[PDB]
């Protein structure tokens, strides 16, 4: 009931037996013959890239609004998977985002953990455009805001419109999980590869966005540690590439 | 595995193309602008000429379509109540009576097939079979017209398709009506032999293969120069 | 037990919609109002944009219909006896020759499919298949156009459907005829993937997803207030 998961000869994550969300209903898989357009063979690096990339922990404070990571840029420096983003041209990968919190029984709160495919984001100034430096950092989260952002080339980071101009309660349409600290502790979503082409270049394109939004805010009394660490762990699935070359970009 | 039906000979040489735009009036003056005339040759239009000249020997039926739009001429003595315009399009089969001008007997010749078409409905269409003593048309002819190697270098060959003549049938006295003909020629059931290289030099006239010496290809920076190497970024470095 | 065929994806996204109304004259002046032009995009019309933006990836054929009504312009030198108006509607396939103005060679290009339509009968119709290098169109694109993350945030994507250009075929000298085109676009065989939430904020421009922060919903009297409790009657008391 405290079963350990070992993925590759480097990683150990301890976890109890809970519920998973599998994509839009499909497991990640390898490309078959009547699915690709490229003129070569994939040569998938299964022997080295399937492991757990535990990112840094964020602190869910009382006055926090939400965080998002854009993928696959969220593993740009994470080990050999970041090297394959350099020394290739096309790529195709599913992921198994595992999100878990360490709260006591005297804490309360609720999170919504969404995976949004093609989460294109609007700018904080109309009649203007975003830059790539405001969409995502390479490994750290980007914070939503309670009030209105007002920059020139930034993102409209207000929290109830989710950066996309929609209702934040309707993000339940995409693959999601609720971390309710009363009963739930962890959340694990298995995203497949969703695109309109069989393989894309994973520098320009952002495949999906992982958003973690607190709907019921964190409350605690005065004895308690005044934050709850949220730890995200991403494991790539069935990664395969094409176009061996040097690191042309970055 | 894709499909190759887009580049078959039927799908490459069978598209309708406007090959001739002329105009013809309906009242007197000189006896030349009262009718239109087009000798059927695939050499006056360069775009279609280059596609046909990828082959030496061709064999096809014709599918000719006529888009006739008329108008009322300005000036005094206007058309006023004009009832409806009828047009005669005559196909003179090769070696057939050819009209010198309007109101000639050639128009009333039974031998030359004709279409009587009234304005306001679908355009006029006709189909002509493969009309040749030979067994194919030839885009090229390395030879002469007479047996003594005398005459013109490949112009009196049996590659004659005929003529097309169009006039107004009406007898309109008051007012002039100027019509404009558009010929949309199209080959059907094309069979092509002996593929030839695509032409490099531009054409000079539609009776020859004459040309000016042009370069094999465009200028390049150097013997080994690739273009615009990616400037150092955060991935290409 | 009722039926759910009214809310299938075909019955929800396949209705004809007027997406573009333009006008084009038939006589000279500036060389811009003599023809019409519409780049085929489902973003200029907000009502249809919101229905398409309930999905991330779409795949459909097009069914475009053109409602062309002309009129006679006022002033001197009137049309008088105008015979019949013929109009050319040209679909420039993506990456195809595009007309700079009227009487250009792009109009006579064989590559761009065209319809010649005469006034007084049923409207002109054409069907365009799914034309993309990709395997679907994308309503959203979280990415960039160049490989270096440079350019515009999702505008040069392979979501190009082409253009539609309309002009008068006639050569009308006296009088001007002003026609008005209505484009009734309709998708056929729609297949849609990855449902997205319906948009809350209003749109600002048809190249972005930019927005202003709007309320989640409308104002209400209080946290627990039902509306207009029935006033005491002889049953409700």
């Amino acid at each position: 009931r405290v079963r350990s998961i070992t993925l590759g000869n480097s990683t150990i994550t301890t976890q109890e037996c809970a519920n998973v969300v599998v994509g839009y209903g499909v497991w990640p898989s390898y490309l078959q013959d009547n699915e690709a357009t490229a003129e070569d063979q994939p040569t998938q690096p299964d022997v080295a890239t399937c492991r757990f990339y535990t990112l840094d922990s964020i602190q869910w404070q009382k006055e926090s609004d939400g965080w998002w990571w854009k993928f696959p840029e969220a593993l740009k420096n994470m080990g050999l998977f970041g090297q394959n983003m350099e020394y290739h041209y096309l790529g195709r990968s599913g992921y198994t985002i595992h999100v878990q919190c360490n709260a006591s029984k005297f804490h309360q709160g609720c999170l919504l953990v969404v995976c949004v495919p093609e989460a294109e984001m609007g700018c904080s100034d109309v009649e203007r455009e975003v830059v790539a430096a405001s969409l995502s950092s390479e490994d750290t989260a980007k914070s939503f805001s309670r009030t209105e952002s007002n920059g020139q080339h930034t993102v409209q980071t207000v929290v109830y419109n989710a950066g996309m101009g929609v209702g934040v309660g309707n993000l339940t349409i995409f693959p999601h999980q609720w971390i309710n600290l009363r009963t739930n502790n962890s959340a694990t979503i298995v995203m497949p590869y969703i695109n309109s082409v069989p393989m894309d270049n994973m520098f320009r394109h952002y495949n999906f966005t992982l958003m973690i939004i607190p709907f019921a805010k964190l409350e605690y009394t005065e004895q308690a540690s005044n934050y709850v660490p949220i730890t995200v762990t991403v494991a790539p699935m069935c990664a395969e590439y094409n176009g061996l070359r040097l690191a042309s970009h970055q | 595995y894709h499909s190759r039906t887009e580049s078959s000979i039927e799908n490459f040489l069978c598209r309708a193309a406007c090959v001739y735009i002329a105009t013809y009036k309906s009242a007197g003056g000189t006896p030349t602008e009262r009718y239109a005339s087009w000798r059927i040759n695939t050499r006056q239009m360069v775009q279609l000429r280059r596609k046909f000249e990828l082959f030496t020997y061709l064999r096809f039926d014709m599918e000719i379509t006529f888009v006739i739009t008329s108008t009322q001429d300005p000036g005094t003595q206007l058309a006023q109540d004009m009832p409806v315009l009828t047009h005669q399009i005559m196909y003179i089969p090769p070696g057939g009576p050819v009209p010198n001008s309007a109101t000639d007997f050639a128009w009333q010749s039974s031998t030359n097939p004709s279409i009587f078409w009234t304005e306001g409905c679908a355009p006029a269409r006709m189909s002509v079979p493969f009309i040749s003593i030979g067994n194919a048309y030839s885009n090229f002819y390395d030879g002469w017209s007479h047996f003594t190697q005398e005459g013109v270098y490949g112009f009196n060959s049996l590659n004659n398709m005929g003529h097309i003549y169009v006039r107004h049938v009406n007898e309109q006295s008051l007012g002039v009506s100027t019509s404009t003909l558009r010929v949309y020629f199209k080959p059907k059931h094309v069979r092509a032999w002996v593929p030839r290289p695509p032409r490099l030099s531009p054409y000079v006239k539609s009776s020859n293969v004459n040309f000016k010496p042009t370069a094999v290809t465009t200028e390049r920076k150097d013997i080994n120069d690739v273009g615009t190497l990616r400037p150092v970024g955060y991935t290409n470095h | 037990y009722h039926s759910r065929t009214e809310s299938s994806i075909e019955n929800f996204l396949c209705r004809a919609a007027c997406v573009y109304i333009a006008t084009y004259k038939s006589a000279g002046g500036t060389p811009t109002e003599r023809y019409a032009s519409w780049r085929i995009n489902t973003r200029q019309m907000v009502q249809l944009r919101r229905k398409f933006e309930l999905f991330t990836y779409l795949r459909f054929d097009m069914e475009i219909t053109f409602v062309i009504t002309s009129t006679q312009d006022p002033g001197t030198q009137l049309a008088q006896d105008m015979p019949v108006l013929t109009h050319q509607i040209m679909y420039i396939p993506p990456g195809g020759p595009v007309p700079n103005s009227a009487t250009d060679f792009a109009w006579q290009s064989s590559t761009n499919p065209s319809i010649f339509w005469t006034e007084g009968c049923a409207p002109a119709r054409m069907s365009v298949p799914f034309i993309s290098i990709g395997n679907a169109y994308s309503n959203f694109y979280d990415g960039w156009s160049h490989f270096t993350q440079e350019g515009v945030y999702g505008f040069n994507s392979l979501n190009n459907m082409g253009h539609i250009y309309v002009r008068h075929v006639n050569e009308q000298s006296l009088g001007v005829s002003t026609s008005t085109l209505r484009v009734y676009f309709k998708p056929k065989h729609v297949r849609a993937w990855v449902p997205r939430p319906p948009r809350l904020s209003p749109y600002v421009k048809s190249s972005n997803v930019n927005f202003k922060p709007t309320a989640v919903t409308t104002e209400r009297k209080d946290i627990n207030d039902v509306g207009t409790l029935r006033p005491v009657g002889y049953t409700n008391h």
Partner: antibody
Amino acid sequence: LQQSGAELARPWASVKISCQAFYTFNSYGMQWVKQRPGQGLEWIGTIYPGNGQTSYNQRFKGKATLTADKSPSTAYMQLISLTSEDSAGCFCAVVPTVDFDYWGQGTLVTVS
Amino acid sequence: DIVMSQSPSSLAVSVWEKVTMSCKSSQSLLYSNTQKNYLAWYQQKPGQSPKLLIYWASTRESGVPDRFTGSGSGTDFTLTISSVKAEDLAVYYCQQYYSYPLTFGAGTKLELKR
């Protein structure tokens, strides 16, 4: 922003120059330029820490070695077989692939 | 190697005289992804370390006047100096971001004439 203090060297020997950057060494490499008072600026090389790459101009290959560690966060350049032609002011600069930005000061190498 | 030319190599000018200076590249330092020229302009004060003047060949820096403005595209550029003052007498070096050997230009020495 910081550079080594003025030092006196001997020909046919090596010199180690230091550079101190307050900014974290990520996504952008450390520039090295050699200034000739008679002529202009000359690039020596850059060591890009974000991907860890090390590169030099052909002229300086075999002359300059570029080495940047993580915990010290100081960039170093070493030159060897010094001659009078190496006496010059050497600057270290940053590059976020957006600009060469600024350089700062630098000890005047004085081979004597 | 991409070389950067500068013409004139130096010129002496008085006060309140609009001066320019060209920096022509042996290769067009303009790529077709963002259309942003890769050229840098630099002022090395007499006996001083150089500072930035114009980056992206188009944009100014802070504490810099409108008598320093980038101008050009492709492979030919210049830096318009509109109203010269007593802080422009120095040597100026252009530079390119494009080819990895980041060579600077010849170096214009804007001289002061009294």
